[PDB]
Amino acid sequence: GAMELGSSMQGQLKLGCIPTIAPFLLCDLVQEINQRFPQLNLLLREDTTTNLLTALRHGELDVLILALPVEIDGMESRVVGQDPFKMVISRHQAGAIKVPIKYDDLPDESVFLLEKGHCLTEHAVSACKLTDKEKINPFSATSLHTLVQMVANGLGTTFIPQMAIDHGLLDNQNLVVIEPPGQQAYRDIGLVWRPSSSRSKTFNQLAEVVSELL
Amino acid sequence: GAMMQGQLKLGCIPTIAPFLLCDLVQEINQRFPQLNLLLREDTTTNLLTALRHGELDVLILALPVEIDGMESRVVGQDPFKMVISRHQAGAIKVPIKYDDLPDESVFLLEKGHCLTEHAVSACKLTDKEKINPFSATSLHTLVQMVANGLGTTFIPQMAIDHGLLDNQNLVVIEPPGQQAYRDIGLVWRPSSSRSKTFNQLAEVVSELL
């Protein structure tokens, strides 16, 4: 984009994204858009899932980038890729917890999770088969950065999306990336927008670019 | 820490937490092996309510702000910087003069983030027309818009040293301000019986700024 644009993939686009995707995925999306579609100014809103859906319905955003599945009511969605889940612990408790990790052998009030309202918590404990709630610590986190920082202090473990690890969220925090126990875990990444939109061809070309980054 | 002793719940604003607390945790894990730290990232106003009601023990805010008359200790200074994309860097001349920029080109965080207050004050931004009406909601998406080429903004130095601008093709610019910085302080309750623990933590943060 540019500060000044002159006279489908051109113009302005208001995009919403969740706090568990925006810091890690939108960095590479901007560099692709800067080169492929130079005259596409891209404005960004980072908010939780239900708030972004409200902003889309009220016409304040043109398209969303969410983690699926979530209740989207009547909007149109397109999955563009999958984002694996991993577990992280510090190297102080690397001997206190065995790999392959198993939930029932862990001490309880050790699994830290984000505040409800972040779709990551419900997606993690569903993709990863975390059924024993007593594992979960009562103190819930309010951001993904502070969630990793508590795990870096050795207070337990958590589930981290792969795109955050690829972006370097765990850098210099002395952590180990452990495969999640049980069954395979991941989350769907898709674009959400209203059916009453003439920019369907603009959203789908962008959905192809996001599909290449995953 | 594991699953200057015991437990401690700390609150920090979103413009400091993703950058400063990474080093603080790695320091505490070695300097005080049994201090467990629970973290709460929220705005300045909501952090003061949680500290006042006992939900949190010690805060880390960007001073100056109204802090309930609580106990505060400034532990360091955080410089400000201006950032632009490389493909828009040839169009903006440095030293920066605000009146030469195009209008609505300075993106800023929305209300509630104290970074917008401290930046426009320390960097002496007076022409409110130069600010784009579209307010940003996170420090990460704010940078990504500037990387897209929409304009410029003020970024704390601790975010730049942490690597927020990596692989974004951004240029760092000195802002026109003789004291363009902000103060990082620890806020806790005067009634607290752990000021011997809070002050010792204030020195570890002072070695990080």
Q: In chain B, what are the domain boundaries?
A: 1-78+184-209, 79-183
Separation in Å, CA of B127 to nearest CA in chain A: 18
Do B147 and A3 make contact, defined as CB atoms within 8 angstroms?
no
With vertex at residue A87, the alpha carbon angle to CA A113 and CA A28, rounded to the nearest 5 degrees, is 90
Using left for φ > 0, alpha for ψ between -120 and 50, and beta otherwise, residue A179 falls in beta
CA-to-CA distance for A24 and A163, rounded, in angstroms? 6
Residue A166 to residue A153: CA distance in whole angstroms: 21
Rounded Cα–Cα distance for residues B150 and A201 (Å): 23
Q: The tokens of A82 are what? A: 């999958």
Token reading at A45: 């809103």
Breaks (C-N over 2.5 A) in chain B follow: 3
Q: CA B133: distance to chain centroid?
A: 22
CATH number, span B1-78+184-209: 3.40.190.10
Q: Residue B66 CB: number of other CB atoms within 10 A?
A: 9
Per DSSP, the three-state class of B153 is strand
Which chain B residues touch A110 with a CB distance below 8 Å?
3
Chain A residues with CB-CB distance to B147 below 8 A: 27, 30-31, 34
Task: Report which residue type is found at A172.
Answer: N
Residues A143/A19, Cβ–Cβ less than 8 Å: yes
Alpha helix stretches (DSSP H) within B11-156: 17-31, 44-52, 114-122, 139-147
Contacts by A197-200 with C-beta closer than 8 Å and gap 24+? A197/A62, A199/A8, A199/A13, A199/A62, A199/A63
CA–CA distance, A169 with B164 (Å, rounded to integer)? 11
CATH for A1-83+189-214 (3.40.50.2000, 3.50.50.60, 3.40.190.10, 3.40.50.720): 3.40.190.10
3-state DSSP of A20-69? CCHHHHHHHHHHHHHHHCCCEEEEEEECCHHHHHHHHHCCCCCEEEEEEC
Exposure of B30 in the CB half-sphere (CA atoms within 13 A): 8
A59 Cβ contact partners less than 8 Å away, ≥ 6 residues apart: none
Question: What is the DSSP pairing of strand B170-173 with strand B71-85?
Answer: antiparallel
Q: Which residue shows structure tokens 């909601």?
A: B137
What 8-state DSSP symbol labels residue B16?
A: T
Amino acid at B94: V
- The 3-state DSSP class for residue A156 equals coil
**Gap between the Cα atoms of A160 and A127, Å rounded:** 12
What does the alpha-carbon distance between residue A103 and residue A6 come to, in Å, rounded to a whole number? 58
* HSE-up of residue A80 (Cα within 13 Å, Cβ side): 23
C-alpha pair distances (Å), B191 with each of B71, B73, B79, B165: 9, 15, 32, 41
A126: distance to nearest CA of chain B, Å?
24
Name the β-bridge partners of B181. B79
B10 in Cβ contact with B60 (< 8 Å): yes
* Sequence positions preceding breaks in chain A, C–N over 2.5 Å: 7
Q: Does residue A90 sit in helix, strand or coil?
A: strand
Q: Which residues of B touch A147 (CB under 8 A)?
A: 39
d(CA A15, CA A6): 21
Report whether the peptide linkage leading into residue A19 is cis, meaning its omega lies within 30 degrees of zero: no
- Asked if A124 and A131 touch (Cβ cutoff 8 Å), the reply is no
B152: which 2 tokens? 């410029």
Backbone angles phi, psi at B59, to 5 degrees: -110, 165
How many CA atoms lie less than 13 Å away from A48 in the CB half-sphere? 14
CB atoms near residue B90 (< 10 Å): 9
Task: Calculate the CA A74 to chain-centre distance.
Answer: 22
Q: Is B14 on the interface with A (CB under 8 A)?
A: yes
A16-54 core/surface letters (b: 16 or more CB in 10 A; e: else):
bbbbbbbbbbbbbbbbebbeebeebbbbbbbbbbeebbe
The structure's method of determination equals X-ray
d(CA A35, CA A16): 21
Phi, psi of A49 (to 5 degrees): -65, -55
Q: Residue B204: enclosing H or E segment and its boundaries?
A: helix B195-206
Sign, CA dihedral B20-B116-B144-B176, equals negative
Q: Does B28 touch chain A (CB under 8 A)?
A: yes
Residue of chain B with shortest Cα separation from A108: B3
Residue A81's H or E segment, with its range, is strand A76-90
**Helix (H) or strand (E) run with residue A163 in it:** helix A162-167
Angle between helices A200-212 and A22-36 (to 10 degrees): 110
Q: Is the distance from CB of B84 to CB of B171 less than 8 angstroms?
A: yes
Q: What is the resolution of this structure in A?
A: 2.3
Which value, in Å, is the radius of gyration of the alpha carbons in chain B?
A: 18
- Counted residue by residue, chain A has a size of 214
Does the beta-carbon distance from B3 to A150 stay under 8 Å? no
B152 and chain A in contact, CB less than 8 A: no
The partner residues of A78 in beta bridges, in order of sequence, read A191
The dihedral built from the CA positions of residue B108, B79, A25 and A83, taken in this order, carries a sign that is negative
Contacts of A33 in chain B (CB under 8 A): 148
Q: How many CB atoms lie within 10 A of CB B193?
A: 7
Asked if residues A179 and A198 have their Cβ atoms less than 8 Å apart, the reply is no
How close A54 gets to chain B, by Cα (Å)? 16
DSSP letter, residue A157: B
DSSP state of B165: T
Provide φ and ψ at A156, rounded to 5°: 155, -140
User: What is d(CA B12, CA B78) in angstroms, rounded to the nearest whole number?
Assistant: 15
3-state helix, strand, coil in chain B (%, to 5): 35, 25, 40
Alpha carbon of B89 to those of B83, B164, B173, B177: distances in Å? 9, 18, 10, 20
Length of chain B measured in residues: 209
Q: Is residue A18 less than 8 Å (CB to CB) from chain B?
A: no
Q: How many CB atoms lie within 10 A of CB A199?
A: 16
